[PDB]
Amino acid sequence: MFFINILTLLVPILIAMAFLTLVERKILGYMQLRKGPNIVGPYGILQPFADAMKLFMKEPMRPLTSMSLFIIAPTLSLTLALSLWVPLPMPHPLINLNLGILFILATSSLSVYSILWSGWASNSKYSLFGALRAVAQTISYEVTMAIILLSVLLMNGSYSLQTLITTQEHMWLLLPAWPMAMMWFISTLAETNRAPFDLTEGESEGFNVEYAAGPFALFFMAEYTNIILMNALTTIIFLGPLYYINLPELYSTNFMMEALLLSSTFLWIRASYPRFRYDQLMHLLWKNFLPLTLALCMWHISLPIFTAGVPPYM
Amino acid sequence: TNMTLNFGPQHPAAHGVLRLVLELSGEMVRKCDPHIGLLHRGTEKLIEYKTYLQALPYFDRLDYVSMMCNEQAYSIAVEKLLNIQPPPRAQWIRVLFGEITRILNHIMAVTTHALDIGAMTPFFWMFEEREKMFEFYERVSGARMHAAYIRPGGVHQDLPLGLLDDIYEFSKNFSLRIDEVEEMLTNNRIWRNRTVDIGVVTAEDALNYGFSGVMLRGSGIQWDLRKTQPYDVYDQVEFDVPIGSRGDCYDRYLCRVEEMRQSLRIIEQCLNKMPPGEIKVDDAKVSPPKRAEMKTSMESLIHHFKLYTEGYQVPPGATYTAIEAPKGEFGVYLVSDGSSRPYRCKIKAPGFAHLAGLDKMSKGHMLADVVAIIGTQDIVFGEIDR
Amino acid sequence: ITHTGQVYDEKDYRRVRFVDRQKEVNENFAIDLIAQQPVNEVEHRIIACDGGGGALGHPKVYINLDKETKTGTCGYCGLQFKQ
Amino acid sequence: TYKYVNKKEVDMKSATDNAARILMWTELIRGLGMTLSYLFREPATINYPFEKGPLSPRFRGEHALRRYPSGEERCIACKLCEAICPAQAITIEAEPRADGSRRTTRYDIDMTKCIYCGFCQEACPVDAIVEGPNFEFSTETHEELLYNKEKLLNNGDKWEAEIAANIQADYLYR
Amino acid sequence: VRPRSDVTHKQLSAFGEYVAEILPKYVQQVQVSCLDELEICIHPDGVIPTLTFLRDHTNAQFKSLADLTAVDVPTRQNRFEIVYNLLSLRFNSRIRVKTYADELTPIDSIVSVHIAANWYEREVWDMFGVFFFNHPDLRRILTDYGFEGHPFRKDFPLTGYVELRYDDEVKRVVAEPVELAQEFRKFDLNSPWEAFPA
Amino acid sequence: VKQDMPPPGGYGPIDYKRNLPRRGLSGYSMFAVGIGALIFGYW
Amino acid sequence: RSRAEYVVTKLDDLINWARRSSLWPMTFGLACCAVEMMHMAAPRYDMDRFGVVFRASPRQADVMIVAGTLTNKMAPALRKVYDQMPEPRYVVSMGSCANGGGYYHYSYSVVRGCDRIVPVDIYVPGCPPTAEALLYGILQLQRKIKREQKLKIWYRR
Amino acid sequence: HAVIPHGKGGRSSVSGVVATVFGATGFLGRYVVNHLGRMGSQVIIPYRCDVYDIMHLRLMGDLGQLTFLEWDARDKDSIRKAVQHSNVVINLIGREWETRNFDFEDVFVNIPRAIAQASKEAGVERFIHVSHLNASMKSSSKSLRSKAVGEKEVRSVFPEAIIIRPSDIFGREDRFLNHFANYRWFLAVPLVSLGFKTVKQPVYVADVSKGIVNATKDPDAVGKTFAFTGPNRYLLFHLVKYIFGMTHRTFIPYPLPLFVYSWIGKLFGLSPFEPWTTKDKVERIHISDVMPTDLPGLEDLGVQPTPLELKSIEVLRRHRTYRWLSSEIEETKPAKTVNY
Numbered sequence A: 001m002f003f004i005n006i007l008t009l010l011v012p013i014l015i016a017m018a019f020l021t022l023v024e025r026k027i028l029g030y031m032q033l034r035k036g037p038n039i040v041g042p043y044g045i046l047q048p049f050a051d052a053m054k055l056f057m058k059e060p061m062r063p064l065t066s067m068s069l070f071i072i073a074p075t076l077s078l079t080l081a082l083s084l085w086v087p088l089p090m091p092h093p094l095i096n097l098n099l100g101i102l103f104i105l106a107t108s109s110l111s112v113y114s115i116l117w118s119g120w121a122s123n124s125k126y127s128l129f130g131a132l133r134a135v136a137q138t139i140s141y142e143v144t145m146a147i148i149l150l151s152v153l154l155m156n157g158s159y160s161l162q163t164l165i166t167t168q169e170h171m172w173l174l175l176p177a178w179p180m181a182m183m184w185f186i187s188t189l190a191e192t193n194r195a196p197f198d199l200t201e202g203e204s205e206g207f208n209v210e211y212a213a214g215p216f217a218l219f220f221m222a223e224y225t226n227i228i229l230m231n232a233l234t235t236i237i238f239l240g241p242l243y244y245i246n247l248p249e250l251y252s253t254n255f256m257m258e259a260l261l262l263s264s265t266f267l268w269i270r271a272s273y274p275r276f277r278y279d280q281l282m283h284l285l286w287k288n289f290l291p292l293t294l295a296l297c298m299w300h301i302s303l304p305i306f307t308a309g310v311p312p313y314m
Numbered sequence B: 001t002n003m004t005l006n007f008g009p010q011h012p013a014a015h016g017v018l019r020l021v022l023e024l025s026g027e028m029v030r031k032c033d034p035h036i037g038l039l040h041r042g043t044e045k046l047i048e049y050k051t052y053l054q055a056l057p058y059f060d061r062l063d064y065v066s067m068m069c070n071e072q073a074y075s076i077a078v079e080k081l082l083n084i085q086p087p088p089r090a091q092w093i094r095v096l097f098g099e100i101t102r103i104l105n106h107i108m109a110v111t112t113h114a115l116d117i118g119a120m121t122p123f124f125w126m127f128e129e130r131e132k133m134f135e136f137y138e139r140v141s142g143a144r145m146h147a148a149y150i151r152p153g154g155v156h157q158d159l160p161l162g163l164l165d166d167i168y169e170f171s172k173n174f175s176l177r178i179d180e181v182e183e184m185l186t187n188n189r190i191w192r193n194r195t196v197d198i199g200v201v202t203a204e205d206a207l208n209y210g211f212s213g214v215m216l217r218g219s220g221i222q223w224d225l226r227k228t229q230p231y232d233v234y235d236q237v238e239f240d241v242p243i244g245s246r247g248d249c250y251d252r253y254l255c256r257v258e259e260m261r262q263s264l265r266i267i268e269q270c271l272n273k274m275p276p277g278e279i280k281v282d283d284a285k286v287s288p289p290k291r292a293e294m295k296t297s298m299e300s301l302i303h304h305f306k307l308y309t310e311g312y313q314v315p316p317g318a319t320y321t322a323i324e325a326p327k328g329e330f331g332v333y334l335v336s337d338g339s340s341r342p343y344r345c346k347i348k349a350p351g352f353a354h355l356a357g358l359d360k361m362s363k364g365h366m367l368a369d370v371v372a373i374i375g376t377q378d379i380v381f382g383e384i385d386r
Numbered sequence C: 001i002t003h004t005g006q007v008y009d010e011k012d013y014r015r016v017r018f019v020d021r022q023k024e025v026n027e028n029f030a031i032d033l034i035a036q037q038p039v040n041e042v043e044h045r046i047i048a049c050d051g052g053g054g055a056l057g058h059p060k061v062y063i064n065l066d067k068e069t070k071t072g073t074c075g076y077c078g079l080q081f082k083q
Numbered sequence D: 001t002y003k004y005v006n007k008k009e010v011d012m013k014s015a016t017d018n019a020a021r022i023l024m025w026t027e028l029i030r031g032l033g034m035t036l037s038y039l040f041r042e043p044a045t046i047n048y049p050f051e052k053g054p055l056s057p058r059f060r061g062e063h064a065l066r067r068y069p070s071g072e073e074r075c076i077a078c079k080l081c082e083a084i085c086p087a088q089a090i091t092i093e094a095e096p097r098a099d100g101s102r103r104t105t106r107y108d109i110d111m112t113k114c115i116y117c118g119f120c121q122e123a124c125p126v127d128a129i130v131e132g133p134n135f136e137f138s139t140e141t142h143e144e145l146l147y148n149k150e151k152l153l154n155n156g157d158k159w160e161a162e163i164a165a166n167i168q169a170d171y172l173y174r
Numbered sequence E: 001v002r003p004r005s006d007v008t009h010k011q012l013s014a015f016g017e018y019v020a021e022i023l024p025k026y027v028q029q030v031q032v033s034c035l036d037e038l039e040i041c042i043h044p045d046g047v048i049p050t051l052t053f054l055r056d057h058t059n060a061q062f063k064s065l066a067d068l069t070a071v072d073v074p075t076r077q078n079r080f081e082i083v084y085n086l087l088s089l090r091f092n093s094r095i096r097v098k099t100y101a102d103e104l105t106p107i108d109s110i111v112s113v114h115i116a117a118n119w120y121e122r123e124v125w126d127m128f129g130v131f132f133f134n135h136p137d138l139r140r141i142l143t144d145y146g147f148e149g150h151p152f153r154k155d156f157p158l159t160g161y162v163e164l165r166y167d168d169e170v171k172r173v174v175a176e177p178v179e180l181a182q183e184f185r186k187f188d189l190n191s192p193w194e195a196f197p198a
Numbered sequence F: 001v002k003q004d005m006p007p008p009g010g011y012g013p014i015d016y017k018r019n020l021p022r023r024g025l026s027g028y029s030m031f032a033v034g035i036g037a038l039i040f041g042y043w
Numbered sequence G: 001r002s003r004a005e006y007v008v009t010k011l012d013d014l015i016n017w018a019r020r021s022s023l024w025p026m027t028f029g030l031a032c033c034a035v036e037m038m039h040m041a042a043p044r045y046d047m048d049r050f051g052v053v054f055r056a057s058p059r060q061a062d063v064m065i066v067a068g069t070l071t072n073k074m075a076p077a078l079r080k081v082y083d084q085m086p087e088p089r090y091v092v093s094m095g096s097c098a099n100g101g102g103y104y105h106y107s108y109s110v111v112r113g114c115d116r117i118v119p120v121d122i123y124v125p126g127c128p129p130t131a132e133a134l135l136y137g138i139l140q141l142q143r144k145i146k147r148e149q150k151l152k153i154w155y156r157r
Numbered sequence H: 001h002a003v004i005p006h007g008k009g010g011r012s013s014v015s016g017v018v019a020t021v022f023g024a025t026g027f028l029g030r031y032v033v034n035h036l037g038r039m040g041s042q043v044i045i046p047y048r049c050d051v052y053d054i055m056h057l058r059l060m061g062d063l064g065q066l067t068f069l070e071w072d073a074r075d076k077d078s079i080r081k082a083v084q085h086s087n088v089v090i091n092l093i094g095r096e097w098e099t100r101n102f103d104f105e106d107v108f109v110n111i112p113r114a115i116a117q118a119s120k121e122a123g124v125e126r127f128i129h130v131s132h133l134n135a136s137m138k139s140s141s142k143s144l145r146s147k148a149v150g151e152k153e154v155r156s157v158f159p160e161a162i163i164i165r166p167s168d169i170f171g172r173e174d175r176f177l178n179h180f181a182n183y184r185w186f187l188a189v190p191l192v193s194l195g196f197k198t199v200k201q202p203v204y205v206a207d208v209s210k211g212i213v214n215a216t217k218d219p220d221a222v223g224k225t226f227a228f229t230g231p232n233r234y235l236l237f238h239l240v241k242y243i244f245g246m247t248h249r250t251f252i253p254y255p256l257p258l259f260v261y262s263w264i265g266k267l268f269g270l271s272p273f274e275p276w277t278t279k280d281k282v283e284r285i286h287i288s289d290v291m292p293t294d295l296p297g298l299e300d301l302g303v304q305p306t307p308l309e310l311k312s313i314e315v316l317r318r319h320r321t322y323r324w325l326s327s328e329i330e331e332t333k334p335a336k337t338v339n340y
């Protein structure tokens, strides 16, 4: 069985990953007074499969470059992103890990390399400049991203994502800790290099510059799967879907609904906002958010103690 | 050379032909030396070998975002040399389509500025309005852009029977469309940052580098050639120049959104007060005879044959006539021998001066800043390269 | 072949362009179409020829159908007029 | 008459108002509302093959040579269409046809050279060369774009019905 | 008939004398065209001095340079006719100062007087070949990097002498002497009958 | 023969001014609802 | 059926459908015909609807639309970018200024056509070729690709 | 039947050579169409490759100079119409691999004999047939032996038909030079007899092309069997190392019996997609270059051969690593010339 449970939890996500690009190229469209892709297939449903086939068939030109730090980079990007769905706790998870959120934080952190490796591998100036800035904001955002989670955990009692289903049986962790949700949402927007915070690989063509066909696709796939995963982590950590032990799927049904809406939100954010400047972006995290996060981090070590609410381990 | 890189000509940023060599210490720009001529095509030499009426189509191509306003400048220039002036209805038309064209340019400049910045929805919102305007061009000239409607002696053909009404419905609504863009960019917590205090140009420096456009107006210098030196019937209308303070990318922008607003005020009037009359001078000497007349009257055929085959035969002289094209002062210095074909026609391009300023504007600025400043100069490489 | 008769001989190179392709020629060859046009009989010595439709025709010319010996032919329409 | 586009106390009410604007991103939320609003508007796009963007009678489109209703081609080779073409596109050489009339042996519009100004439409005395409505004549090979008299006359015969309607609508204006 | 306002013709004429007196040196043939336009003509040496007086004089402030151009009259010994068109924002007026320069007799540069000229002077060198001393950086602005010849000179062929195509053998773009497939038809247009000057 | 001209009496009036609406919840009120949410959540 | 020839054709078709449904263009945007393409990308005539993406870098671009005069200085670049695209690549010349030389054919700085610097597959005519016309031209590229039969020639070779 | 040559000599000029060239898509071909197009000749290029692949040839030809016709070797009718209006026919039809439904004899002998028969019927003034150098009916490699059979036959279908016989060709996109350079992937570079006793004389592709073109426009060549050879011979050892030298990749010439190696060629030959090495190739590679005894080619036909070292830098540059691409040939050491 366990193998079947690996197809499910993977394919299903890959098929959904494909349908996100479509729901991105249509929701951005109607917002901009245009139908979007509807001519290939019925209502554009076959559109994601079509360019996938075009991308893989086109020549994967190897520049006159490394040949490994070039092919390792997309493999790593897809591998980490699809891997991080392993411990996610939809209803009950596939591989329940006692230190689950540290797994998600660590696996995300590893993706910054793929950007670094691809930028060095390309051996062209646009790629290296883009990679250095890209690596900078990714790890810069990781620092507030991690502290925001540590505040959460201390009110959850453990690192296991499964505990939050029992923590959020009466109220979402948005009500409490909303100030961080916002700061988790903005950090989720930075770490998926989505719009407001998408300076790398902008209209300025960073680490796709030299990447075409199959390599382009793999990161590509990775980004979008991440786009979902991070949104899904928002939908478990802060928006806690109702859980009934008798019927486990209403948890997944609402997880489905909240994840799609917050996934819709970063699509909506992209069309709505101009992109921030490179330093504007770091100015936000180190000046605007990190002092807010570190202080609210202390408030979340104090809220438990003097409100005699220290969370139950386990 | 501070890892000097050359901004891409194909780059989506830029208007397609800007090889901006930039030596950058990391992400800071030390010096910008724009390269030009990637679109030089010979427009100034070609005109010497063509007659006045067959050189009119070149002007539409000089800066084609602003298709017509450019023609008006050659028109005016050729009319001055002949000491002929267009009929009253034609004048209003030229101001009607002169302004419609200003909107078209500003929708281009504001929305294309945002696309480089990264905001993409304003472009699609206003390109639909643009589209609707093009249709005016087409139903008046025949071409969506590159019309050739404003000729040296007035307009070519009267407005179709019904256009004015539609240039109303549109105008009646376009405002809301500008308003929307606003709710998306004027106060965006982020548009301001990337635009505010970027490329500030002093008032004295703007006059010195010959900026002559919104770029001057944005710095607070009050100069609109349309109010200072009225051309056509822009004197009979009433509009407010949108002067700016704390000149910077954001302020000038606000100015371009404000002239979009003021042009709707000028368009309204033109629709309200356009006179009954003829749309071309009655001198068969300068304007081609009506086709019913050339097919029934000998003097009209002779005048049709000579005008199309040989030309106006402008009296010898030279003139520099400048209008207020949407980008800035567009002027034609047209030296002319008594011949039917011009001798020289230097096109002053608001843009040759503006690009030059890129160096004195983008100093100690990041790569992204350079992208913002090329946008705030509305550089159309056709006018610069000519 | 065509209105003018442009044709390529066997030895003629420059005829390959049609190999496996088609040439543009005209049925309704005009050379014969006005010849197919009846002679417009008239009463007056001289007659006009707007080409038909005024502004949508040719610059109006007056033809002298004065000699039955010759049917005036407006240089624009090739229409013969029979006095 | 001029206007100041951007020419410009601290009260808790004011400040608290301003601080909330920075802290909870109030104006950013305003922008999202605008795009959500259009998402609900009807899209303006047209099915391109099925529905076509409207072009009125003066649209210049693709060159055609007309013929008289009788069947005699209108052009009489005065060759001023060649004289006024800005791009040097039209090449005309003529000789008296056996009929004795004046006709063009070769009329070649190089469409790649042509910039579709529409002056030829203007210049012709018999109005033999017209700007036809069709804009869809994209061709696989460069040679196809060069057009001789037979293609243009054939183009004229195919679109004569609409060309006649278009000239009918706009001739009073000219 | 254009709506001439004699009020102007006079005021600009009066300024033309004013300038002629203020700079008797370097200024000749000052005339106000029938188009209400003034066109002081200066000896080439007066480039720096005449401009500076106009840029910085209370009674004649001509702050921005609208354009710098060079007509080429091949007949004229001094081939080029550098023309500088200047605008007074304060007085709402415009003036033209035109000098003469031969091919190998350079003119001074006014980048000092107006920095607008930094680019136009490079444009005049590239197209006509006049040279401007003391220019910060003269270099082709419009022509190709390897272009030989100054294009807007009346003695330069329109089509030029070189054109570019991609050659497979050498896998690189390559100039070749121009071979045109339909030469520019040079219609003669001047009519042998003049028009009795009004 | 007819010439396209403004309708008799002139056309109606157009808007040439921004009609952007300054509509928002007052700041204090905004903060209070938020702080109240956290207080309830903490309890 | 199983006789390979049939099997091959079907496979080829699939391959053609994928490339023909999703063509990602890149717009050098020389000159003005670029404005008439931005109109295609715009709402009346949505390019995306057909699967054409509004923008793409050269590495990820299937078709290059050369809009505008290809001047002698820009001629070396055009080539570079054409040479920097994938193995299945195509060029749609747009504008009389790039089909041939256009109003600027006899100039000294304008290449008389881009098909002298890059092989061109569809030539879209018109000084500002109408946006609908470009769309017609992009659609004819789609019929050109549909007819291509790469694997059947492999099989029969 | 002729076309007076008018013009200055470049594109958009006329030379009067209408020429069918059946295998133009080839490495040699590409070059043949280049000069023919440069000169202004009318070139009809028969093709059976897809239109996308034939695009590269379009640009070097001027407007209307190049005409492409759909043609199938098995179908006699296709060859018939191609030569209908040509006066010069050039045959470059060969493939070193034996494909499943085109065997070596068919491509080298059957297809040319039919093509030559067609132009005798058409009345083409001259036919140029290309066969590999040192080709004898009892030679080692079938390809060569067959090609030898071929040159004979076509003589009977088309008498006085020129037969240029080029050596293995040196040029960008060639095999002779790239093949060896691509041995990099292989850690060791096998060389029969350790790359000795198979002296080889390369010839630049262009030289060959120019030569071929000059044939088309010269009465001196009729029934001539020219041999474009080269400017210097080489023992395969220096060639291999030299290549690796410019490529800046190590060299380990390893002796391996041709016996066993013919087997390696068989292995690649087995591969479905364009086998990289061929049993017939292998033999050819170690087939010693024959001393020029046939009709002189280059120089004789008007082009002075071009030394290998001169242009090698361009052919082997892509084979080179990230660094050493700016390495240039004159700082590099040119290998010694062994005439033997």
Ligand SMILES: CCCCCCCCCCCCCCCCCC(=O)OC[C@H](COP(=O)(O)OCCN)OC(=O)CCCCCCCCCCCCCCCCC
Residues within 6 Å of the ligand: A174, A179, A180, A181, A182, A183, A185, A186, A189, A196, A234, A238, A269, A284, A288, A289, A292, A299, B189, D022, D023, D024, D025, D028, D029, F034, F035, F038
């Ligand atoms: C007893 C009580 C104890 C607790 C006390 C709590 C007190 C009240 C809470 C205080 C903190 C509230 C706000 C916290 C988050 C915001 C922090 C912040 O200041 O934002 C940074 C930035 C500021 O904007 P800027 O103008 O650049 O900076 C000015 C100052 N330099 O803002 C930005 O730039 C934002 C850019 C955003 C770009 C994307 C926008 C997306 C908007 C839609 C999504 C909104 C979030 C949705 C979340 C859904 C659920 C997760």
Ligand SMILES: NC(=O)C1=CN([C@@H]2O[C@H](COP(=O)(O)OP(=O)(O)OC[C@H]3O[C@@H](n4cnc5c(N)ncnc54)[C@H](OP(=O)(O)O)[C@@H]3O)[C@@H](O)[C@H]2O)C=CC1
Residues within 6 Å of the ligand: G157, H022, H023, H024, H025, H026, H027, H028, H029, H048, H049, H073, H092, H093, H094, H095, H096, H102, H107, H111, H130, H131, H132, H133, H166, H167, H168, H169, H174, H175, H176
């Ligand atoms: N390069 C070399 O190794 C040398 C070659 N030669 C001779 O010169 C000639 C050209 O050489 P080269 O260009 O390298 O050869 P290529 O391998 O490039 O092939 C030459 C042409 O032959 C065509 N062709 C091959 N098989 C068939 C077939 N069954 N039916 C129709 N056409 C076919 C190919 O077309 P397509 O691929 O489109 O089917 C190709 O365009 C060869 O015939 C060879 O004998 C002489 C010395 C050295």
Ligand SMILES: COC1=C(OC)C(=O)C(CC=C(C)C)=C(C)C1=O
Residues within 6 Å of the ligand: B011, B012, B013, B014, B015, B016, B112, G026, G027, G028, G029, G030, G031, G034, G035, G037, G038, G041, G054, G055, G056
């Ligand atoms: C007018 O100048 C141009 C641009 O900047 C303004 C573009 O971004 C682009 C790119 C736009 C599209 C349609 C991808 C083009 C085509 C261009 O020429």
Ligand code: SF4
Residues within 6 Å of the ligand: D074, D075, D076, D077, D078, D079, D080, D081, D082, D092, D123, D124, D125, D126, D127, D128, D129
């Ligand atoms: S003008 Fe009209 S009639 Fe005279 S030649 Fe040109 S086309 Fe024929």
Ligand code: SF4
Residues within 6 Å of the ligand: B061, B064, D115, G030, G031, G032, G033, G067, G068, G069, G094, G095, G096, G097, G098, G102, G103, G126, G127, G128, G129
């Ligand atoms: S073709 Fe017409 S539109 Fe396209 S570039 Fe040349 S001129 Fe501008």
Ligand SMILES: [Zn+2]
Residues within 6 Å of the ligand: C049, C050, C051, C058, C074, C075, C076, C077, C078, C079
């Ligand atoms: Zn008649």
